[PDB]
Write a protein that binds this ligand. Structure first.
Ligand SMILES: *[C@@H]1O[C@H](CO)[C@@H](O[C@@H]2O[C@H](CO)[C@@H](O)[C@H](O)[C@H]2NC(C)=O)[C@H](O)[C@H]1NC(C)=O
Ligand SMILES: *[C@@H]1O[C@H](CO)[C@@H](O[C@@H]2O[C@H](CO)[C@@H](O)[C@H](O)[C@H]2NC(C)=O)[C@H](O)[C@H]1NC(C)=O
Ligand SMILES: *[C@@H]1O[C@H](CO)[C@@H](O[C@@H]2O[C@H](CO)[C@@H](O)[C@H](O)[C@H]2NC(C)=O)[C@H](O)[C@H]1NC(C)=O
Ligand SMILES: *[C@@H]1O[C@H](CO)[C@@H](O[C@@H]2O[C@H](CO)[C@@H](O)[C@H](O)[C@H]2NC(C)=O)[C@H](O)[C@H]1NC(C)=O
Ligand SMILES: *[C@@H]1O[C@H](CO)[C@@H](O[C@@H]2O[C@H](CO)[C@@H](O)[C@H](O)[C@H]2NC(C)=O)[C@H](O)[C@H]1NC(C)=O
Ligand SMILES: *[C@@H]1O[C@H](CO)[C@@H](O[C@@H]2O[C@H](CO)[C@@H](O)[C@H](O)[C@H]2NC(C)=O)[C@H](O)[C@H]1NC(C)=O
Lengths: 583, 583, 583
């Protein structure tokens, strides 16, 4: 009787199913959450008189219908068009070469080009109908507003590392962007993968290749699967023979089956409309004093700085520099960002060994952390590489039968070294990784592991006749703070010929290691690594109540009242009586 | 008149049958339970106006329809795609190489590749319709909330080993994950199994193999079973002759029969939609102070640590390291995880014998446990391998005719040894296993059993002329705490050439044994071993009432009131009057 | 019961969907916002009796239908007709050569001509129906009026750099123009791309080329896709062979499919009408004392000067001077504006290095900005090029447990130099750009970066044997204030042979740099750079209340009352009593 169903009973019209305002993940092109609030109170319609739209939504009739007769050749996977999220992946940002490179449509296309030495062609029937946009005066959703107040409460009780944790659960549920405009329509695409040596002789007749690819697309749709085709004349005999893959997907409308008139596909697009393009803005753009009137001024500029840090950390991880030229050696298959590390010679290095010590600062009673946090050399110059503090909580139970239990914490800082007539290297495996020497979390035969950063193992053998089959050279560790001195004989990268691999993200700082195997390189493409990148804190910090919030340079002060009402602006006679009881 | 039927009478629409929120087992890809609460109060619909959805559910119209013309070749069973649970099996976890490897679809595919030396190809018509997701603000179900309170009660009456038992009945009923997003659709798949020597000569024309496999798939669907096919031209004469198996399964829609137009299959998908992909989060992620407001803070971080231990124990069991290379010898067929134990030489070892002693600490009266818990040598260096305590309860009946009965417990710790001119080895069989030397729970001819770990038998014969037909060599016992010293002449694995096998899980710790038979290896694939991995306790621990719960480091205290009301936060004037009567 | 639905129930007529009054972006031909208010109170109709129009709207029946039998040849992309926004892109302005050159239809056409050496021909069926215009007496919208009052409030509290920021969020949401008249209709266009050497021999028979192009267009529409064509006689055998691309788009009406009678397309245009031409006026034209009666006179002439500056800044950026002649060398592909920089010789220049110093004026406590704002020479005459001040805010927390937090600001002015036996040049990459030497944000091998303008890196190597593969020459920096002295051996442009590229827009002033690579030139076309071009201010300026507003030269004064009522005109007896308490 309220909301949609009140409008839907009076009008008896469908609701437009393609709406802006939701969140958007831009590494993996998926949408998530609902940032903006959508209400159906005035019973608005599209001025066709055909759909029902919310109140803060205006549509623009496009009624456009493209129809292409030539496929387009896109040879490299580095410059990637998306066909559904092209306007939002190509924004001007620092990470424009990482957007969209963890999606379903991209990971298939990179696989089919590398494993077959192939080039791809697509041809398309696109058919845009509306453009749906949001008004500039707009209200946040009920569930998204409550999660911004919780980050503000943790920042005003001096609880960092809990506000940081709640900011990374905001990226996980709402993405990195907000879509401000979509495009309702229905596409129909065919992608083929031709052998790359079929293009190189037909450099003059490249226009004859793509003319037959768009010719075969309209035989596939118009003719039923039995061969009544009109394309097999001259070069639709090697086009069929140099191709390595073919698929046809429809995105809106009715489902596609071979042999359906393009007349009949285009008459089922009504009431089956999806978003075939979209654009938007980053997520921290919508955190400003205009959208949040209840909080003070400089407090929402501190929440918006926390969310901006969590988004940029999510792009800093899931970024793999390496070599990208396919015909060159040292080709890294997991790398999504070029480095210039191609055509670079190598030089062998000898590492003496790794060792690890612990400190055991506070928790001397009832918990002994400083036995597994220590690792000594099985057999140069060591480097420190990390200063990491490990905290653990335990439980007493004082009984008196009534009892009580108290929870302490136990700190133990550890230090992990490596030496710059030497131990061999057999790979690494962690609690989120495997060793690709064995395709399993095990060192090979003869090798023995030893812990280095409290979560991963270091496959090492001291021999020179039996473990020489799995021995791969080593290039050096570095971190987010200290680069290795092996490059520039500093910078944070591998030397030439080597490739880096992530290992052991530890509280907003990952360390890396350089190898030269060729076996760590290949395999399947890695998935995206989702936030939170930190385990939850133990609530060890005490809450410090803040009552008055001020800034010095325009003489504005916000006084929180009793009862936790709200934040009102401080009149200059009440803050005069509130600072004496404070100071 | 309430719930679904109120909405269903007014709207007269079907309910969408593919919903998130339920649990999910990730070793065996099955779903179980219902973790989240789903209510039908606002009578929401999908904005098509076609289905009825719950209140805390938003759908995303995809309306996509893939159609592939080439089969895909996947040669090894180690890297396994699932076609229905691919997004959730490939999560970043420690056990990513164990997910999905106890399901129906996997165990068939591993069988057909090993027993035939075959490779598999699949081709597919996929047709995704909606994407159904859950809101981030969400309530737990009524039945799942009551089972989390019962684990908290056992932890606050100092009843460990009963809270551990109730946590493993939570994994049995609700799985290891919670699905947060599903994909409603309908697939149509054909899998074939070609001989592996048919690929190796057609390395150049591998693109001609897969083009005919996708050609035969559309003759099978479009043509009725009588041969009107258009594929038998050149190489659809050995493709039919090198294949070893073929099946066609449909997953949604109407049932498949040979000869049905793809037009007609795609018009029955409405109202017959199933989940063709899903993704989710682990089960202990949803146990936090946000979801459970009634319990104290550090108490639900102790329940969530108990459930995380029970899930990781369920992946630690059902994990079989071994050799995986098929053409290599020492191939273990039951192994689902590689080890590097391939291409390893063997060395014979002589074991003197096993013997077992008991202690009989407490139950000296009316129960004699220390006669069957003892086993002496029928005929080096012994090792202890286990310190296990065995508890049994009995019953007095004091009569006075009125009577009364009291229940005691009887403890008897046992120790089980083995010796590091020697007894022969004929296999083992237990109360959950058989001896594969006989395919039965019996020692072979000449062999006599003797107990070792109070539940299994040790087939042993002292002869050298008659029991030499069933004698297999022996590689050594180890446990979850002590590895054997026979490897690295320590580590917890077999030496080279040998294979390990589970035996006698005893209270969260299994022991293993290394053999070299080739007969223990083969057979059928083992099923998953389901929790609980411990028999129920005898309630021997006394309940210790806890009233006040505090943590030291933010000065918060929770005071339980009388009557077992609930846990309220302790004001600093009531805990002042509650600690004096306590301490 | 009000608005549209009251008129729509009584009349039972559709609403005309093509209306003026909305905003319009003129670089990218898209429409956005709604500047004018549209009300449906009198229930007016089009005097056909066919549509429903708003009250302040008059339509003109055209009922015209063009039909062309010859394609038109447009060879160069510099003079670009738009076919949907031709009347509004060709206005008399300073930036008439930049209008429409960031749209979807233009960027495709520039790509297909450069990459193929092609010329384009279009043929069209146009069919104009109405002309819809706005009355001269007209009211602003509710949402656009509220955003003009907010710019006026920031200008009367002496808050510049916040009123400048709110003016650039007005261009982002409402564009650069307002459409005052549209044209409802439905076009049907075919564009082809012929090889440019096919025109040059048929200079006499250019009329035979375009006669067959309009002949093939009516075989495509009238005949179904099977070849029943009547065009293949003499020169529809090389016209089919010299063409490189072909598409057919419809803009209004029903969707196009090959084989539909032109009879049948022209009977579906009713109720499917879109804007096929439009014209309008700039956005600051509609900010005058007539439209805003509440504000004073000289105050709305100050708001309208602020918005005019933000629009002209948006055209000053997104303007790329360079070479445009395609067959000439030094061809810049990203350039949209000619320069005369073609056919110009080059001269090598040696730059010693770049260095950077900081000042740290105010924020000496708790924040050290003057360590990363400094960069020293790794190894002439330096020039200053910029004087930029960097402000950052921090947070104290004075505790007393009650606490309070104060927000300061920290200023640190920096200076960035470059020298007019020399460092090599390897490219630049920034926080909104990449290095095109690597197609990634990385310096090549041997090169090391060093910061220059607090956001970008300068790829530099001091060697002469290894980094000679990626070394490109350098032409000099300049800015919006200082041109380089290398041209005219001043002007703000490159010397001959070089090309400029944008880098580091910093608060309404960009700096540029001249290179000569040929690799920085190519690639994909850049998207439009959208406002705001400045990060939000930190509210450091104090609000200065203004009460009376006067101008000297007609003796008019506006007195703001109490309560923030409004601005009334000052009677000469109240301002007499208001200036004494003021002065
Ligand atoms: C507010 O939180 C910060 C962050 O932890 C506290 O700063 C640290 O406090 C510890 C405790 O003495 C010191 O050992 C560290 O050196 C401090 N680090 C920094 C960067 O200041 C701070 O003390 C807290 N303030 C209050 C009043 O609790
Ligand atoms: C893949 O493409 C190449 C073209 O580069 C094909 O090679 C030609 O095939 C035709 C077929 O009759 C021959 O007449 C030519 O002599 C071949 N060579 C050249 C240089 O054109 C090749 O056949 C294609 N692959 C398959 C399997 O057909
Ligand atoms: C709470 O339960 C624990 C777990 O059993 C008890 O700890 C054991 O108690 C027995 C009985 O004296 C001792 O022999 C063990 O050595 C204890 N083990 C550990 C690890 O502490 C504990 O005593 C119980 N507390 C109360 C008050 O009943
Ligand atoms: C299994 O595949 C092999 C191909 O590796 C088939 O062997 C070929 O069969 C054709 C059939 O006429 C012969 O002409 C070839 O000479 C055979 N050998 C090779 C190397 O191509 C084999 O026939 C297939 N199995 C069955 C049962 O047909
Ligand atoms: C009104 O705003 C202007 C703009 O900032 C102020 O002018 C500057 O004020 C600072 C502060 O003393 C001076 O250092 C600058 O030299 C001034 N610049 C110019 C161009 O005047 C102005 O002072 C403000 N007026 C009031 C009353 O606050
Ligand atoms: C592209 O256009 C040129 C015309 O400039 C074509 O060249 C002529 O092709 C015809 C076809 O039989 C020949 O008779 C002429 O001798 C060719 N030359 C001239 C100067 O007219 C060329 O063939 C076209 N391209 C394609 C692929 O057909």
């Amino acid at each position: 009787e309220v909301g949609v169903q009140k409008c839907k009973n009076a009008l008896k019209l469908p609701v437009l199913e393609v709406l802006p305002g939701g969140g958007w993940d831009n590494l993996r092109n998926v949408d998530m959450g609902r940032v903006m609030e959508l209400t159906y109170s005035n019973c608005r319609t599209t001025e066709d008189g055909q759909y029902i739209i919310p109140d803060e939504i205006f549509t623009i009739p496009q009624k456009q219908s493209n129809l292409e007769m030539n496929s387009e050749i896109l040879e490299s996977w580095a410059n990637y068009q998306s066909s559904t999220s092209y306007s939002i992946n190509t924004e001007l940002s620092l990470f424009s070469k990482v957007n969209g490179k963890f999606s379903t449509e991209f990971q298939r296309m990179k696989t089919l080009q590398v494993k077959d030495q192939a080039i791809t062609t697509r041809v398309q029937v696109r058919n845009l109908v509306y453009t749906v946009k949001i008004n500039p005066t707009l209200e946040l959703s009920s569930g998204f507003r409550k999660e911004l107040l919780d980050i503000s409460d943790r920042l005003e009780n001096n609880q960092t590392r809990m506000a940081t944790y709640l900011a990374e659960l905001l990226v996980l549920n709402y993405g990195t962007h907000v879509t401000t405009s979509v495009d309702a329509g229905a596409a129909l695409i065919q992608e083929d993968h031709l052998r790359a040596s079929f293009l190189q002789d037909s450099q003059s007749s490249r226009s004859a290749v793509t003319a037959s690819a768009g010719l075969a697309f309209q035989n596939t749709v118009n003719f039923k699967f039995e061969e009544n085709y009109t394309s097999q004349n001259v070069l639709t005999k090697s086009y069929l023979s140099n191709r390595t893959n073919s698929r046809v997907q429809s995105i809106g409308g009715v489902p596609f089956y071979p042999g359906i008139t393009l007349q009949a596909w285009q008459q089922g697009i009504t009431n089956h409309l999806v978003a075939i393009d979209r654009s938007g803005l980053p997520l921290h753009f919508f955190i400003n004093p205009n959208m949040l009137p209840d909080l003070p001024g400089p407090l929402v500029k501190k929440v918006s700085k926390t969310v901006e840090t969590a988004v940029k950390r999510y792009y800093t991880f899931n970024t793999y520099p390496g070599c990208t030229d396919l015909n060159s050696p040292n080709f890294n298959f997991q790398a999504n960002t070029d480095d210039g590390s191609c055509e670079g010679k190598m030089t062998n290095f000898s590492f003496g060994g790794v060792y690890q010590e612990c400190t055991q600062l506070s928790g001397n009673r009832d918990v002994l952390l400083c036995q597994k946090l220590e690792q000594k050399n099985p057999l140069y110059s060591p480097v420190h590489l990390l200063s990491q503090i490990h905290e653990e909580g335990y439980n007493h139970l004082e009984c008196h039968t009534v009892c009580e239990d108290v929870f302490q914490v136990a700190k133990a800082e550890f230090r992990a070294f490596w030496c710059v007539s030497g131990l061999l290297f057999g790979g690494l495996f962690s609690s989120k990784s495997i060793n690709p020497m064995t395709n399993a979390q095990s060192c090979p035969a003869g090798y023995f592991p030893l812990r280095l950063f409290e979560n991963l193992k270091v496959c090492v053998s001291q021999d020179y006749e039996l473990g020489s089959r799995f021995a791969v050279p080593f290039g050096g560790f570095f971190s987010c703070t200290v680069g290795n001195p092996l490059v520039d004989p500093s910078l944070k990268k591998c030397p030439g010929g080597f490739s880096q691999h992530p290992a052991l993200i530890s509280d907003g700082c990952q360390v890396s290691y350089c190898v030269k195997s060729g076996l760590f390189t290949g395999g399947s493409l890695p998935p995206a690594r989702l936030p939170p990148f930190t385990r939850p804190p133990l609530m060890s910090q005490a809450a410090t109540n803040t009552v008055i919030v001020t800034n010095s340079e325009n003489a504005r002060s916000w006084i929180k009242d009793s009862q936790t009402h709200q934040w009102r602006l401080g009149e200059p006679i009440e803050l005069r009586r509130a600072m004496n009881v404070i100071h």
